[PDB]
Design an enzyme around this catalytic site. Structure first.
Site, PDB file in Angstrom:
ATOM      1  N   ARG A   1      -1.040 -12.370   8.925  1.00 51.29           N
ATOM      2  CA  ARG A   1      -1.458 -11.615   7.749  1.00 51.29           C
ATOM      3  C   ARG A   1      -1.347 -12.443   6.478  1.00 51.29           C
ATOM      4  O   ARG A   1      -2.020 -12.135   5.488  1.00 51.29           O
ATOM      5  CB  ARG A   1      -0.618 -10.346   7.603  1.00 51.29           C
ATOM      6  CG  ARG A   1       0.843 -10.646   7.349  1.00 51.29           C
ATOM      7  CD  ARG A   1       1.681  -9.397   7.194  1.00 51.29           C
ATOM      8  NE  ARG A   1       3.088  -9.765   7.089  1.00 51.29           N
ATOM      9  CZ  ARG A   1       3.897  -9.936   8.131  1.00 51.29           C
ATOM     10  NH1 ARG A   1       3.449  -9.752   9.369  1.00 51.29           N
ATOM     11  NH2 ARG A   1       5.159 -10.288   7.934  1.00 51.29           N
ATOM     12  N   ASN A   2      -0.507 -13.478   6.483  1.00 50.54           N
ATOM     13  CA  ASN A   2      -0.302 -14.345   5.332  1.00 50.54           C
ATOM     14  C   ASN A   2      -1.016 -15.680   5.483  1.00 50.54           C
ATOM     15  O   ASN A   2      -0.627 -16.662   4.842  1.00 50.54           O
ATOM     16  CB  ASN A   2       1.193 -14.554   5.087  1.00 50.54           C
ATOM     17  CG  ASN A   2       1.842 -13.344   4.455  1.00 50.54           C
ATOM     18  OD1 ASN A   2       1.179 -12.568   3.767  1.00 50.54           O
ATOM     19  ND2 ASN A   2       3.141 -13.169   4.687  1.00 50.54           N
TER      20      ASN A   2
ATOM     21  N   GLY B   1      -6.876  -4.551  -1.326  1.00 46.90           N
ATOM     22  CA  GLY B   1      -5.859  -3.990  -0.461  1.00 46.90           C
ATOM     23  C   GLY B   1      -4.679  -3.520  -1.283  1.00 46.90           C
ATOM     24  O   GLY B   1      -4.476  -3.948  -2.425  1.00 46.90           O
TER      25      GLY B   1
ATOM     26  N   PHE C   1       3.942  -3.955  -1.511  1.00 47.22           N
ATOM     27  CA  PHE C   1       4.051  -5.107  -2.401  1.00 47.22           C
ATOM     28  C   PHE C   1       3.417  -4.840  -3.760  1.00 47.22           C
ATOM     29  O   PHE C   1       3.876  -5.373  -4.778  1.00 47.22           O
ATOM     30  CB  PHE C   1       3.400  -6.332  -1.750  1.00 47.22           C
ATOM     31  CG  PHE C   1       1.951  -6.134  -1.396  1.00 47.22           C
ATOM     32  CD1 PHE C   1       0.953  -6.375  -2.329  1.00 47.22           C
ATOM     33  CD2 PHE C   1       1.586  -5.709  -0.129  1.00 47.22           C
ATOM     34  CE1 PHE C   1      -0.379  -6.188  -2.007  1.00 47.22           C
ATOM     35  CE2 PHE C   1       0.254  -5.524   0.200  1.00 47.22           C
ATOM     36  CZ  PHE C   1      -0.728  -5.764  -0.740  1.00 47.22           C
TER      37      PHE C   1
ATOM     38  N   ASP D   1       7.984 -16.265   5.145  1.00 45.38           N
ATOM     39  CA  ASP D   1       7.155 -15.129   5.557  1.00 45.38           C
ATOM     40  C   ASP D   1       5.826 -15.604   6.140  1.00 45.38           C
ATOM     41  O   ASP D   1       4.761 -15.069   5.830  1.00 45.38           O
ATOM     42  CB  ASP D   1       6.907 -14.169   4.393  1.00 45.38           C
ATOM     43  CG  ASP D   1       6.431 -12.802   4.858  1.00 45.38           C
ATOM     44  OD1 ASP D   1       6.092 -11.963   4.000  1.00 45.38           O
ATOM     45  OD2 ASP D   1       6.411 -12.565   6.084  1.00 45.38           O
TER      46      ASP D   1
ATOM     47  N   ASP E   1       0.971 -16.599  -0.137  1.00 47.93           N
ATOM     48  CA  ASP E   1       2.221 -15.911  -0.459  1.00 47.93           C
ATOM     49  C   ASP E   1       3.433 -16.839  -0.442  1.00 47.93           C
ATOM     50  O   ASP E   1       4.564 -16.383  -0.266  1.00 47.93           O
ATOM     51  CB  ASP E   1       2.461 -14.720   0.474  1.00 47.93           C
ATOM     52  CG  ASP E   1       1.733 -13.475   0.022  1.00 47.93           C
ATOM     53  OD1 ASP E   1       0.997 -13.555  -0.983  1.00 47.93           O
ATOM     54  OD2 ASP E   1       1.900 -12.419   0.663  1.00 47.93           O
TER      55      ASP E   1
HETATM   56  C1  LIG Z   1      -4.685  -9.233   6.754  1.00 49.70           C
HETATM   57  C2  LIG Z   1      -3.771  -9.144   5.532  1.00 49.70           C
HETATM   58  C3  LIG Z   1      -4.486  -8.232   4.506  1.00 49.70           C
HETATM   59  O1  LIG Z   1      -5.237  -7.384   4.877  1.00 49.70           O
HETATM   60  N1  LIG Z   1      -4.232  -8.446   3.076  1.00 49.70           N
HETATM   61  C4  LIG Z   1      -4.897  -7.575   2.041  1.00 49.70           C
HETATM   62  C5  LIG Z   1      -6.250  -8.370   1.461  1.00 49.70           C
HETATM   63  N2  LIG Z   1      -5.712  -9.386   0.751  1.00 49.70           N
HETATM   64  C6  LIG Z   1      -6.440 -10.551   0.230  1.00 49.70           C
HETATM   65  N3  LIG Z   1      -7.847 -10.720   0.531  1.00 49.70           N
HETATM   66  C7  LIG Z   1      -8.556 -11.861   0.023  1.00 49.70           C
HETATM   67  N4  LIG Z   1     -10.002 -12.013   0.342  1.00 49.70           N
HETATM   68  C8  LIG Z   1     -10.810 -10.824   0.740  1.00 49.70           C
HETATM   69  C9  LIG Z   1     -10.417  -9.802   1.563  1.00 49.70           C
HETATM   70  N5  LIG Z   1     -11.429  -8.933   1.667  1.00 49.70           N
HETATM   71  C10 LIG Z   1     -11.428  -7.703   2.448  1.00 49.70           C
HETATM   72  N6  LIG Z   1     -12.491  -9.416   0.897  1.00 49.70           N
HETATM   73  C11 LIG Z   1     -12.109 -10.560   0.340  1.00 49.70           C
HETATM   74  O2  LIG Z   1     -12.899 -11.365  -0.514  1.00 49.70           O
HETATM   75  C12 LIG Z   1     -14.231 -10.892  -0.656  1.00 49.70           C
HETATM   76  C13 LIG Z   1      -7.792 -12.889  -0.841  1.00 49.70           C
HETATM   77  N7  LIG Z   1      -8.164 -14.026  -1.444  1.00 49.70           N
HETATM   78  C14 LIG Z   1      -7.080 -14.544  -2.081  1.00 49.70           C
HETATM   79  N8  LIG Z   1      -6.031 -13.711  -1.863  1.00 49.70           N
HETATM   80  C15 LIG Z   1      -4.671 -13.848  -2.341  1.00 49.70           C
HETATM   81  C16 LIG Z   1      -6.463 -12.708  -1.109  1.00 49.70           C
HETATM   82  N9  LIG Z   1      -5.714 -11.506  -0.575  1.00 49.70           N
HETATM   83  C17 LIG Z   1      -4.214  -9.100   0.547  1.00 49.70           C
HETATM   84  C18 LIG Z   1      -4.135  -7.551   1.038  1.00 49.70           C
HETATM   85  F1  LIG Z   1      -4.715  -6.753   0.006  1.00 49.70           F
END
Ligand SMILES: *CCC(=O)N[C@@H]1CN(c2nc(Nc3cn(C)nc3OC)c3ncn(C)c3n2)C[C@H]1F
Length: 269
Positions: free
Chosen positions: A139-140, A19, A23, A135, A153
């Site tokens: 979403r977090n 994503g 940020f 926050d 976060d």
């Molecule tokens: C809903 C909030 C959002 O969309 N945040 C995006 C995705 N982020 C994020 N994602 C993961 N795991 C993940 C998401 N997808 C689509 N696939 C996976 O793993 C296969 C995650 N794991 C640890 N952290 C910190 C993550 N962040 C943050 C934004 F890019």
């Protein structure tokens, strides 16, 4: 300081974009610690390059690395170059906001109430540490497995405006406490109980303060019984001291989780 690993650039590789936004960028990647025989799936969050003290950055990262709770994401390692890159465990199911929207037809009352318990347990851990998140939102919250969620976060705001998740005293006076985190928790539960609706949808951020001042609040989600909505409403009281404490929210939501169909009316559940 042995909680926080300082990673060389060779020790982690970005493989897939997860994503992007204001940020910075979040990647799915591999952590290949030198002198080890393993490659670890991780998420890599590269914050947007900034024109602004490294000592205070590491110091805040040490705190983020010190969180030790099954429902708060820990900082695994950091890489400081021209940018800040944060490495943490990969949560394969993504954010809880996207999850409740994608599974709105297949989420039962037990999952929803278990998530409320786990989020309150994570926030209560932070309060015991005298740490304020600032926050909290759906979403977090990240999904490790459907029955195991973690708040993410933490400390990122201090390392660096969510008006519709903020308590009125935070909007008006930029005051952030554990009790203003409770307000954000109330909004987060509302996101869950509506399967990811946007709070105050279409309303400009500058209008929210006047909505709260007049006494209006987010509406009762269709699946919520009055007992659950009363908890949300108590989180949104003007007097911060009158809001529930995270320790009390654990008890009450754990009680509801023992008979979930009584407190959430969901078709097919
Ligand atoms: C809903 C909030 C959002 O969309 N945040 C995006 C995705 N982020 C994020 N994602 C993961 N795991 C993940 C998401 N997808 C689509 N696939 C996976 O793993 C296969 C995650 N794991 C640890 N952290 C910190 C993550 N962040 C943050 C934004 F890019």
């Amino acid at each position: 300081q042995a909680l926080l690993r300082i990673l060389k650039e060779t020790e982690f590789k970005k493989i897939k974009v997860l994503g992007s936004g204001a940020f910075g960028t979040v990647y799915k990647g591999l952590w290949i610690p030198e002198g080890e025989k393993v490659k670890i799936p991780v998420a890599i969050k590269e914050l947007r390059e900034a024109t602004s003290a490294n000592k205070e950055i590491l110091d805040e990262a040490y705190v983020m690395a010190s969180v030790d709770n099954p429902h708060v994401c820990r900082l695994l390692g950091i890489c400081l170059t021209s940018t800040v890159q944060l490495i943490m465990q990969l949560m394969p199911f993504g954010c809880l906001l996207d999850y409740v929207r994608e599974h709105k037809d297949n989420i039962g009352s037990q999952y929803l109430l278990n998530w409320c318990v786990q989020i309150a347990k994570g926030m209560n851990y932070l309060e015991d540490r005298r740490l304020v998140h600032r926050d909290l939102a759906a979403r977090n919250v990240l999904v490790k497995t459907p029955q195991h969620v973690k708040i993410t976060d933490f400390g990122l705001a201090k390392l660096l405006v969510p008006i519709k998740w903020m308590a009125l005293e935070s909007i008006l006076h930029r005051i952030y406490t554990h009790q203003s985190d409770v307000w954000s928790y109330g909004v987060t539960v509302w996101e869950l109980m509506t399967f990811g609706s946007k709070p105050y949808d279409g309303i400009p951020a500058s209008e929210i303060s006047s909505i709260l001042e007049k006494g209006e609040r987010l509406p009762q989600p269709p699946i919520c019984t009055i007992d659950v909505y009363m908890i949300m409403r108590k989180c949104w009281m003007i007097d911060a001291d009158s809001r529930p404490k995270f320790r009390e929210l654990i008890i009450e939501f754990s009680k509801m989780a023992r008979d979930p169909q009584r407190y959430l009316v969901i078709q097919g559940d």
